[PDB]
């Protein structure tokens, strides 16, 4: 449960509208989608330059729903013995 809001980083409301729709809505209240029988999306593909809000709004989306932040670094996923990042 990191501490962040959506007002700490502004101007991304255009991207936040797509994030809240694909993250906050299927997570917070799922009773609207479960009554229709459809399956809610568990994620959305994100891409962009560093510092553009991809990693800035990560803890923000986790703080709105009060979730644990787990970050997977790319250099940490490559090792010698089979294990580690695979686990």
């Amino acid at each position: 449960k990191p501490t962040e809001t959506y007002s700490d980083v502004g101007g991304l409301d255009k991207q936040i509208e797509e994030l809240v729709e694909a993250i906050v809505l299927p997570m917070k209240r799922a009773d609207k989608f479960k009554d229709m029988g459809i399956r809610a999306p568990k994620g959305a593909l994100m891409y962009g330059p560093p510092g553009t809000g991809k990693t800035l709004l990560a803890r923000a989306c986790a703080a709105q729903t009060n979730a644990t932040f787990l970050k997977l670094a790319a250099p940490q996923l490559v090792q010698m013995y089979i294990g580690e990042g695979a686990k």
Binding site: P75, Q76, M80, Y81
Partner: protein
């Protein structure tokens, strides 16, 4: 004395070889560079049984125990590459790395080959000289100096004597750590060496921690980022957890040196740690003149020469190329058989650099 030490193998060494070998080798098994145990059953509490060799690795479960003095039997106990559970309190930190560490408090270097570098000093005046002198000024500014300072320029020039010139005005402690020597056969030498740098920086305030040749370490490499061993991979942890989180920005500072910024980890190049990028330019007509007049004090020359016209014919040059003008000036005097270098010797030394190189 010669015959006295010969028979000690039958008398004194019999006890020494028993307590120093047989006890250490008991069961297919004081600086400790190695530890091994084979099939040891001890009732969770002081279990250990850790094989430092990459073959047949072991772990320790069933709770947590802290015994920094003696874990189980003493004797052979080690961590080395992979850190397992409760084995942390006794790391094998012994190593003759003292030849690598160079610590100079308040260096006396002012201007030798750095004459005319005051432009780069102004770049280091605000984010280095200012906090190391009056750190309380940043309280009213609202911001603080960035964590690290990145250096850039020609390879092997400007990253040595220019860093010590700033520490003179601030009376700080300059610690130079060579990155190529951080890489040894011991896995984790790069991360362990960085640990002791912040430990000594907390005792004495206003110290400068300098990392020489960071390209040999960086944030990741093949044997660590792409490999299974952890040395540089654990080195980046000491530059993040310690410096950023625990250590205040005013007293403790970090500076690197590199030929190219892309050779480092893009994770470190992001803001919050590495911000200031200092590019090393070349001395001007006034800067190159003050360097030649200093070298002329230790070299016999003519009293009627002029150092301004010597640096004028030579274009912008590095710190080494300027010292070459003075050293080669004595070579032309050998052909003329003179004890001192006249003005014509310096003119031929400049043309030797212009024509012989053409860079």
């Amino acid at each position: 004395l010669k015959q006295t030490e010969n028979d000690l193998k039958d008398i004194e060494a019999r006890i020494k070889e028993k307590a120093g070998v047989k006890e250490s080798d008991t069961g297919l098994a004081h600086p400790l560079q190695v530890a091994r145990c084979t099939k040891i059953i001890k009732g969770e509490d002081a279990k250990y049984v850790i094989n430092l060799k990459q073959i047949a690795k072991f772990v320790v479960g069933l709770g947590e125990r802290v015994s920094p003095t003696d874990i189980e039997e003493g004797m052979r106990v080690g961590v080395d590459r992979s850190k397992y559970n409760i084995e942390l309190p006794l790391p094998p930190r012994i190593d003759p790395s003292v030849t690598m560490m160079t610590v100079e408090e308040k260096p006396d270097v002012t201007y030798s080959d750095v004459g005319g570098c005051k432009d780069q000093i102004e770049k280091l005046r605000e984010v280095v000289e200012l906090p190391l002198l009056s750190p309380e000024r940043f309280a009213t500014l609202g911001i603080d100096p960035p964590k690290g300072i990145l250096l850039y320029g020609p390879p092997g020039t400007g990253k040595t004597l220019c860093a010590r010139a700033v520490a003179n005005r601030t009376d700080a402690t300059f610690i130079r750590v060579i990155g190529s020597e951080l890489v040894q056969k011991y896995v984790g030498e790069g991360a362990r060496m960085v640990r002791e740098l912040f430990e000594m920086a907390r005792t004495k305030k206003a110290c400068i921690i300098f990392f020489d040749e960071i390209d040999a370490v960086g944030g990741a490499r093949f044997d660590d980022g792409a490999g299974g061993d952890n040395e540089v991979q654990r080195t980046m942890l000491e530059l993040i957890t310690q410096l950023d989180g625990f250590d205040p920005r005013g007293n403790i500072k970090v500076m690197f040196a590199t030929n190219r910024p892309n050779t480092l980890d893009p994770a470190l190049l992001r803001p919050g740690r590495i911000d200031r990028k200092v590019e090393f330019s070349l001395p001007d007509l006034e800067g190159r003149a003050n360097i030649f007049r200093i070298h002329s004090k230790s070299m016999s020359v003519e009293r009627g020469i002029r150092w301004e016209l010597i640096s004028r014919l030579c274009p912008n040059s590095t710190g080494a190329e300027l010292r070459s003008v003075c050293t080669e000036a004595g070579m032309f005097a050998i052909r003329a058989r003179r004890k001192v270098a006249t003005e014509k010797d310096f003119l031929k030394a400049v043309d030797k650099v212009i024509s012989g190189y053409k860079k």
